[PDB]
């Protein structure tokens, strides 16, 4: 157990040969073991500082942005009032850097969708969020027959209402999600084309997210939807060094090779602050 | 039905709230969890693992980016020359930014505890010498000579078979916790300075190299704690990904 | 789900309400509280500490603002002359506005209890004399002479080694509580008047000063209570700060 930090015991001076706490051999590969009460003269301190804020749940159970959907009136992206978005977390840096500290995670989720006009104004309009598992029919238009949601879960909500939220279980075939996959997903020959599938893990492709404005004709307002994600019941394994350089592509550790930068800041000389 | 009342806190989406929500999949059972080695149960578990410290963060160009991990040591005229100095502030930008402790501490506003810096000598077997490492508590400026630096807590390091020594920076402070130090008003939380001085010399016989290097590893003690989670100060994107 | 109903009190933000709200920091532990001397557990604890009373609030200019803390006393013709009068209303603007009791009482509408005013003599050691301090209950106007003031409750003060006497103003009232008195209708809550009269003389030998001063300190007794918190009548700003 470790509910609080360790105390400090009273120590005195020592002058004896043979026992040397200070000298070490870091070539072995293990951290130090010399403490404060073994290299200087210390007093008695009763530490009562809590360590409950550094747990995995306390560090990951905070909402963050992961998605963005645009439904414009005039444009080229989604001019038909419907959109399809594949579920990915690696789209934004703040959450990605946090979740990429470890290799395997197992967790539930709580998704919250906030919708408003591009100017921030709220107007009366109705929508339908539909969760499309892999292998289900994906809608292709605003009046697609697949919108009957006979089996797939769906949510009807209005803009003027408070943002809708749902709870999500752990749906992976594996024992945990993995953000790094050193290998290929097919038994092929890997000549050149397969290299675009390097690291593509099928165990992380959880489905598709579909949104439309309920109606037959075109709507009257442009709309934007923001998807926020929060983690709970989190377990982690095998931590790895944190990210250093900028991100370039989703689900790819690629970095700008010509512009490489140090981790921290720099100074002029080593003998001067 | 039952008469109720609404308090002035409704309809707000609070990111840090802990709440109950309606599940989407009724009667769903997840895949069983097998035993996978290397489980983390607390961010403090991996806050006590030594990592390489960038004391010599002078160079900047692409081809010499690896030279920041060590600083050189050679023979002098035996007058107690200076080797290297830096500030022992984990959260403040500087040499500590290259460690796992430094990166993790950026996610938390306040910290408390004792640190620990380990130096390893990577020279030839026939080269011997002694060095003095001193830690100046807050208030005293950078020492101008060894005889002024020896007043604060210090340790004498002797080269030999055991090639590593550890300097422990005890938690000496006026407040129970310290916020992250920065230039200006927030210098109130500065922890001090660290200096390395030549004790006698770097002695080497004929036929052996004249220049060696030292590698420094930093970590935290068993009473290290952090609180008041926040967001990091660095964003690793320059637009859409 | 459970059928409910909404009562006509929803969506209102009431400043004095006591309610539950969603915390922003989950699993947060504050810094431990060490022992700091001088803790207050009730505003009534420091309502019984004597403070200087401004009976002589005549002057107004900047250079003589200190002269308001005492009133003079000298030798007369021994005809029972008058010295000073004032009203014993803690909440009403006047001499009592300069005490901690007077300032605190402005935050509360109604009060009840007994007051206490202490006079200290700061003359030479060889000067002697006696004074009469009288408290006229409500209904009687300001006394025109000593023989008319002596009817109400009074105390005779004798100069000597013990240089301080205390006149206790007993709680004499018709109602259980009194609101703050002011000119007009609200004079119904007036507490009375206080007067100071010469008893015999201020006698002084040759070679000693002819004029002395008195300092008055006021406080409240052990049965003093206040209720119905409100806001003060003075705002200490003249725009944006």
């Amino acid at each position: 157990p470790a509910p609080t930090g360790q105390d400090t015991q009273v120590s005195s001076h020592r002058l004896d040969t043979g026992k040397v706490p200070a000298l070490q051999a870091a070539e072995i590969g293990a951290s130090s073991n010399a403490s404060d009460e073994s290299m200087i003269e210390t007093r008695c301190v009763l530490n009562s500082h809590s360590t409950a804020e550094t747990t995995l749940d306390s560090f990951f159970s905070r909402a963050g942005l992961v998605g963005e959907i645009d439904l414009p009136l005039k444009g080229t992206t989604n001019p038909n009032g419907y959109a399809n978005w594949d579920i990915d977390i690696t789209g934004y840096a703040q959450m990605r850097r946090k979740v990429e500290l470890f290799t395997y995670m197992r967790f539930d989720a709580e998704f919250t969708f906030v919708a408003c006009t591009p100017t921030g104004e709220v107007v009366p309009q109705l929508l339908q969020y539909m969760f499309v598992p892999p292998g289900a029919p994906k809608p292709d238009s605003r009046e697609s027959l697949a919108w009957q949601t006979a089996t797939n879960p769906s949510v009807f909500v209005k803009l003027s209402d408070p943002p809708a939220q749902v709870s999500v279980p752990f749906m992976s075939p594996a024992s945990a999600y993995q953000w790094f996959y050193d290998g290929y997903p097919t038994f092929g020959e890997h000549k050149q084309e397969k290299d675009l599938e390097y690291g593509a893990c099928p165990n992380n492709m959880m489905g598709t997210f579909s949104v439309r404005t309920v109606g037959t004709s075109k709507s009257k307002y442009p709309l934007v939807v923001r998807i926020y994600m929060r983690m709970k019941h989190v377990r982690a394994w095998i931590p790895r060094p944190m990210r250093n350089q900028n991100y370039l592509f989703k689900a790819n550790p690629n970095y700008a090779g010509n512009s490489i930068k140090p981790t921290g800041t720099s100074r002029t000389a080593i003998t001067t602050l | 039905g039952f008469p109720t009342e609404l308090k002035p806190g409704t309809n707000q989406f609070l990111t840090t709230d802990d709440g109950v929500s309606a599940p989407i999949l009724p009667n769903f059972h997840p895949t069983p969890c097998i035993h996978i080695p290397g489980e983390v149960r607390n961010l403090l578990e991996l806050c006590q693992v030594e990592t390489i410290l960038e004391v010599n963060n002078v160079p900047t160009n692409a081809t010499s980016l690896m030279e920041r991990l060590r600083f050189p040591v050679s023979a002098q005229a035996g007058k107690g020359e200076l080797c290297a100095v830096f500030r022992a502030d984990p959260g403040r930008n500087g040499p500590w930014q290259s460690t796992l402790l430094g990166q993790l501490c950026g996610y938390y506003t306040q910290w408390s505890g004792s640190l620990e810096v380990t130096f390893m000598f990577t020279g030839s077997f026939m080269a011997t010498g002694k060095m003095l490492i001193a830690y100046t508590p807050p208030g005293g400026p950078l020492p101008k000579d060894r005889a002024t630096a020896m007043l604060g807590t210090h340790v004498i390091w002797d080269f030999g078979l055991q090639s590593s020594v550890t300097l422990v920076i005890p938690w000496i402070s006026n407040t129970h916790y310290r916020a992250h130090a920065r230039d200006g008003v927030f210098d109130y939380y500065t922890t001090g300075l660290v200096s390395i001085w030549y004790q006698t010399n770097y002695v080497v016989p004929i036929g052996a190299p004249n220049t060696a290097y030292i590698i420094a590893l930093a970590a935290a003690q068993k009473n290290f704690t952090m609180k008041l989670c926040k967001d990091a100060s660095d964003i690793l994107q320059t637009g859409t990904i | 789900g459970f059928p409910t109903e909404l009562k006509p009190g929803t969506n209102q933000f009431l400043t004095t309400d006591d309610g539950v709200s969603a915390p922003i920091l989950p699993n947060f532990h504050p810094t431990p509280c060490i022992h700091i001397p001088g803790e207050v557990r009730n505003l009534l604890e420091l309502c019984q500490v004597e403070t200087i009373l401004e009976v002589n609030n005549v002057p107004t200019n900047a250079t003589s603002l200190m002269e308001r803390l005492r009133f003079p006393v000298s030798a007369q013709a021994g005809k029972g002359e008058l010295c000073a009068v004032f009203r014993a209303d803690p909440g009403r603007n006047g001499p009592w506005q300069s005490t901690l009791l007077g300032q605190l009482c402005g935050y509360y509408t109604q009060w009840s209890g007994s007051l206490e005013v202490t006079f200290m003599f700061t003359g030479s050691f060889m000067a002697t004399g006696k004074m009469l301090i009288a408290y006229t209950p409500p209904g009687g106007p300001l006394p025109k002479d000593r023989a008319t003031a002596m009817l109400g409750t009074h105390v005779i003060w004798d100069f000597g080694l013990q240089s301080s006497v205390t006149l206790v103003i007993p709680w004499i009232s018709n109602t259980h509580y009194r609101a703050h008195a002011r000119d007009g209708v609200f004079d119904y809550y007036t507490t009375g008047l206080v007067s100071i009269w010469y008893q015999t003389n201020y006698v002084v030998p040759i070679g000693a000063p002819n004029t002395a001063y008195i300092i008055a300190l006021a406080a409240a007794q052990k049965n003093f209570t206040m209720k119905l918190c409100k806001d003060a009548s003075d705002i200490l700003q003249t725009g944006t700060i």
């Binding site: 470790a2 709870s167 | 068993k222 | -």
Partner: peptide
């Protein structure tokens, strides 16, 4: 944990158990 539905994964995060094994990563020496 507080739950209002028939599914355990719809409950709140709750309070974990404070246990640490720092020797797993810091002192793995045989």
């Amino acid at each position: 944990t507080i739950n209002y539905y028939k599914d355990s994964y719809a409950a709140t995060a709750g309070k974990q158990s404070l246990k640490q094994d720092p020797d797993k990563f810091a002192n793995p020496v045989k």
